[PDB]
Swiss-Prot record, chains A, B:
Residue numbers on the Cytoplasmic membrane side: 53-68
Domain notes: The catalytic reaction induces conformational changes within the rhodanese domain, as well as in the transmembrane alpha-helices.
Subunit structure: Homodimer.
Protein name: Thiosulfate sulfurtransferase YgaP
Length: 68, 68
């Protein structure tokens, strides 16, 4: 039990990650087809929010005993 | 100096908030005009990630001495 695992972070990674993924595939499949093809935009966005959310979810509620 | 104010979260709230806002205004102004009008979607999304990111940014790097 390193961190108290609050809800001020889990909501950011959960809501931020999920929402992003969706709004991303949409903003790219609807507003991304104009830019280039629709993979670089939604793709780069997913990868970003992905690595970020992960690092945050760990620093907030790392899988310590999650896999003891 | 309550918290060390890391960057594992500051990146999620900063990048997540900014990106979300943009990807939202687009996914709604392009893929939202189909749903209803294009305000309920992008709007609810903005407010959501807004209050969330804020609560997180504060719980991590609250404006303690920021305005002492």
């Amino acid at each position: 039990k390193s961190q108290p695992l609050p809800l001020m972070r889990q909501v950011q990674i959960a809501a931020g990650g999920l929402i992003l993924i969706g709004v991303v595939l949409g903003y790219t499949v609807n507003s991304g087809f104009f830019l280039l093809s629709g993979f670089v935009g939604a793709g780069l966005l997913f990868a970003g929010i992905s690595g970020f959310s992960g690092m945050a979810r760990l620093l907030d509620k790392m899988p310590w005993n999650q896999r003891a």
